[PDB]
Symmetry: D2
C-alpha cells in the first residue's frame, strides 16, 4: 500500500519547477507517492518528473478529468477521438515514468451536465475506455475509473454503477477508484461500496466533505477505513484537498473551489499523512485480533 | 413547528392538476405543509392552490432557485432586474395565498459557476435581496436565504457566510434556510452551524446525502436534530427528495438528478413524515428532561 | 421478522396482572411480539400468559440472566446444577407457550465479576449450555447466547468470542444474540460483528446507549441496520429499555438502572415501534435497489 | 492545554521503578503529562516521582477511585472517614509534587453497586468532598469529579448530575472531569455535555468505547473534540487505556479488564499522542476560520 498526496496540495502549475516542487514537498510531508494532475498530458515534462521522483525515492501516479472538447461520452465522434488521444498520451506518460496507475474521470467530461447521459454517448464512452485500457494493458498500466458526484459526471455516480460499466468491458486491468468526498454524497454508507467493489477496487482518494483538512468535516472515515481493512485493500491511498490558496487554471474552476480552507500546505500535508497512517495503524490492530 | 413536504415528491408539473395532487398527497402522507417549487411564479395558478389548500386545511410555502437570465448576483443590472421581477412575483403569489415563508437560492443563480463571485456581483445581489425583503415585509412574508453547496452557488456555501451577508442587510424579516443535504458537504459538522445561526435560522430542509429515502445515506441527522432542540428551533421542517422517477422540466436538470432513488412516492412521503416526527419526538424527551420538574 | 418489545417497558412485576398488561400494551403499541423476562421461571404463570397471548394474537419469547446461585460458569458443580435446572424450566415454560426463542445471559452470571473466567469455569458453562440446548432442541426451542459488556459478564463480551464458544459446542439450535447497547461498548464497530456472525445471528436487541428512548443517545443504529440488511437478517428485532420509573426486584439492580430515563411507557413503546419500523423500511428500499429488476 | 497519558498504559505497579518507568515512557511517547493512578496514596514514593518528573520535564496529575472500605457515600461515618483520610493524603501528595489537578471517582466507591444511592449517603459524600476541596484549595490544587458509567458509580453518571452536585457545594476549585468512554454510554450525545459543563469542565479523559486503541471503537471523537474547540477548553486532555497485558492488582479487576486489547504499549502510547494532537490541530483550523 502506497500512501500518496495529490499535487494540488502544493501547486497548480506543473512546469519543471512545479514538478520538482510538488515531489519534494510530498516527500517532506512523509508520503510514499505523488499523484500528478495530468489535465494536459501533452505538455507534461516527463524527464523532469522522472528525475525528481528518483531524487526523492517517490512513486507516482496520474489522474485527470476530461472536458467538453475531449468528452468521450459525446455523440460527436470527433470529440470522442480528441478525448481518446488525450487518454492515450496520459497512459504513455505513465509508461515513460515507469508508473502503474492511471485514474480519474476518463469516461466523461468532469463537469455539471445539464441533461442525462445518452445511450449512444454511453456506448462511445465504454468503447473508448476499453481501447485505452487495452493500450494501457500492453504497457503494464492499470486504469481505474473514478466514481464522482452528480455535479461532476452524469455517468458514474456510485460504485455499483461503476461495477456494471466494468462488467460490460471485461478488461483485466480496469478497476474502480473511490473517493470519500464523493461517496459522502452519493453512496448509502461508507462500507457497502467497499464490500461491493471488493477486488475491483484499485485506487482510493481520501478527502474531507468540503475537501479541506481531514477531520474537519462530515466524512465517516472510521467506517470507511474499517471496511478497507475488512477486504484487505492494499492499493494506493491518496490525500486530496483543494483551497483557493493554491489555484490550477482549469481544475480549480472545474471543481468549484471558492473557499480558502487552508493556507499552510506544509501543515496540511503533514497532518493528512499522519491522519491516514494512524488510521491504518488502528485498522491493523483490529485485523491482528482477527487471528 | 410545521412538518412540510417539498412538491417534487409528488409531481414535476404544477399545473392545476399537479397543484391539487400535491396538496392532497402531502396531507394524506401526514404533513402539515406543502412547499411549492415556484421556478416560474408568473404561470402558477394561484386560485387553484388557494382552493386546494382551503379544502385540505393545509399550509403552504414556496421556494425557488434563480437562473442565468435572472441572476441577481450578475454584474449586468438588466439581468438583476429580471431576477428581482421574478422574486417579487414569487412574493406576490405567496401573499395571495396568505402564506408567510419564501425561501431558496434567491441571492444568485442556482448553478455551477465557472468563476468565483465578484465584488460588483455581490453588491448587486445584496441590494436586490434587500429590496425584495422590504417588499415582502409589508406583505407579511419572511424571506430566508438557502445556503447550498459549491456546485449550486458561489455566494453562500456556509451558514457563517449567510450570517455575514445578513448582517450587512439588517432586515427583520430576512433569515437563513439550512438544508441537511448541503450541510453534509460544506459544513464542519451538523451542530455548529445551527448553534451559530440560532435565531437567524428560519427554515430547514431535511434531505438525505443523495436526496433519496431518509436514513439511506450518510447524513448525521442525530446531531442535527439535537442541535435544533438545543436552540429551540420552531420553524418549518420540510422533507426534500428528488428521483428521476419524477422530473421537473428545469429544476431536476439544474440539481443533477440523474438517478432513480425511488419509484413509490406514496411510500416515500409517508416514511419521511414518520422519520422526521420520530426524530422530533426523541429530542422532545431530551428537552423535557432538562426541565427543572424532572 | 418479528418486531418485539421487552417486558420491562411495561411492568417490573410479572404476576397474572402484569403478564396480561404487558401483552396488551405491547400489541397496542404496534409490536408483533413480547419478550418475557424469566428471571424466575418457576413462579411464572404460564396459563395466564398462554391465554393473554391467544386473546391478543401476540407472539412471545423469553430471556433471563443468571445469578451467583445459578452461575453455570461456576467451578462449583452444585451451583452449575442449580443454574441448569433454572434454564431447563425456562425452556419448559417456553415449550408450554409454544414459543421458539430463549435467549439472554445463560452461559454465566449476569454480574460484575471481580476476576477473569477460569478454564474449569468455562468448561462447566459450555457443557451445561450444550445439555440445555439439546433439551431445548427436542422441544422445538432455539437458544441464543446474548453477548454483553464487561460489567455483565467475563465470558462473552464480543460476537467473535460467542462464535468461538458456539464452534466448540456445534449445536444446530444454538445461536448468537446481539444487543446494540452492548455492541456500543465492546465492539470495533456496528457492522463487522453482524457480518462476522451472519447466519449464527438469531436474535437482536435494539437498545440506546443509555437504554432510554431510541435516538436519544450515541448508538450508531444507521450502520447496524444496514449491516442487518446486508446479511438478510430475518430474526426477532426487539426493543429493550429500562428506567427507574419501572423497577424489577432483581433485574433492575443487576443492570444498574439508577436513572429516570422515561416516565411515559405508552409514549416510549409507540415511539420505539415507529423508530425500528422506520429504519427497517429504509433498509428495505436499499435491498430493493440491489434487485436486478431495478 | 497539557496532553497527558494515564499510568496504566505502562505499568500497574508504582514503586520507585514503576514511577520512573511510567514517566520515561510517557515522555518518550510525546506526552506533556503523566496521570498517576493513586489508588494507595499512602505508599506512593513522592521523592522518586518528583525526581523523575524533573528529569523528563513532565507535568503530573493524579486520579483514584475509592472502594468499599473508603466509600464516602456510605452511611457509616467510619467508612466515610477512612475515605476522607485517603483523599486528603492524595491531595497532600499532589501538593508535594507541585501538581495542581486531582480527579477521579472520589464521591463514591468505584464499583457496581447493587442498590441506588441513599439520601444520607449522598449528604455524607457531598460534605466530605466539600472539606477535601477546601483543603485542596488552601494548597493551590483543583479537584475534579469524574462522571462515570452506571457500573462504576450510582451517584454521578452524567455531566448534568455532576453540575447539580457542584451547585450545592459551591466551591471555587471544584470542577467536572469527563471521560469519552463513559460519555459514550450515559450521555445523549458528545457535544451537549461539553456545552452544558462549559466552564466547570476542568479535566478530560480520551478513551475508546472498549478502552483499547483510539479509533478502533464506537466513540464519536469528532463531535467531542469539535465541542471542546467551541467552548475553548484548555485543561488537560489525557489518554486512558487498559489491557490484560498490563495489570494493576486492584484497578484492573475493578474496571473489568478481561481482554487483551493491546500488547505493544510503546506503539499504543505514540499512536494515542498522535491521535489526540492531530485532532486538536484539526480543531484549531476550524477555530482559526471563525475569525
Ligand atoms: Mn478525487
Ligand atoms: Mn433545499
Ligand atoms: Mn439485552
Ligand atoms: Mn477515566
Amino acid at each position: 500500500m502506497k500512501i500518496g498526496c495529490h499535487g494540488l496540495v502544493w501547486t497548480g502549475h506543473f512546469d519543471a519547477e512545479g514538478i520538482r516542487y510538488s515531489v519534494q514537498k510530498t516527500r517532506e510531508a512523509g508520503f510514499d507517492l505523488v499523484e500528478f494532475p495530468l489535465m494536459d498530458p501533452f505538455s507534461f515534462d516527463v524527464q523532469t518528473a522522472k528525475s525528481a521522483l528518483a531524487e526523492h525515492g517517490l512513486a507516482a501516479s496520474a489522474s485527470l478529468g476530461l472536458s467538453d472538447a475531449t468528452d468521450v461520452s459525446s455523440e460527436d465522434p470527433a470529440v470522442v477521438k480528441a478525448g481518446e488521444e488525450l487518454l492515450n498520451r496520459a497512459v504513455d506518460v505513465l509508461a515513460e515514468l515507469g508508473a502503474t496507475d492511471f485514474c480519474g474521470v476518463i469516461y466523461s467530461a468532469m463537469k455539471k451536465y445539464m441533461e442525462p447521459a445518452t445511450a449512444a454517448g454511453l456506448a462511445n464512452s465504454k468503447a473508448a475506455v476499453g481501447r485505452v485500457a487495452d493500450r494501457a494493458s500492453d504497457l503494464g498500466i492499470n486504469v481505474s475509473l473514478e466514481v464522482v458526484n452528480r455535479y461532476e459526471t452524469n455517468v458514474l455516480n456510485t460504485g455499483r454503477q461503476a461495477l456494471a460499466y466494468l462488467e460490460e468491458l471485461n478488461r483485466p486491468n480496469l478497476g474502480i477508484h473511490l473517493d470519500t468526498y464523493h461517496m459522502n454524497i452519493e453512496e448509502s454508507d461508507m462500507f457497502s461500496p467497499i464490500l461491493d467493489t471488493a477486488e475491483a477496487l484499485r485506487y482510493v482518494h481520501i478527502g474531507e466533505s468540503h475537501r479541506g483538512y481531514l477531520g474537519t468535516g462530515s466524512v465517516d472515515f472510521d467506517t470507511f477505513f474499517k471496511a478497507l481493512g475488512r477486504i484487505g485493500y492494499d492499493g494506493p491511498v491518496v490525500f486530496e484537498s483543494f483551497s483557493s490558496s493554491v489555484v490550477a487554471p482549469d481544475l480549480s474552476r472545474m471543481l468549484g473551489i471558492w473557499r480558502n480552507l487552508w493556507a499552510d500546505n506544509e501543515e496540511l500535508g503533514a497532518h493528512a499523512n499522519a491522519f491516514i497512517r494512524d488510521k491504518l495503524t488502528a485498522i491493523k490492530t483490529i485485523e491482528l485480533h482477527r487471528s
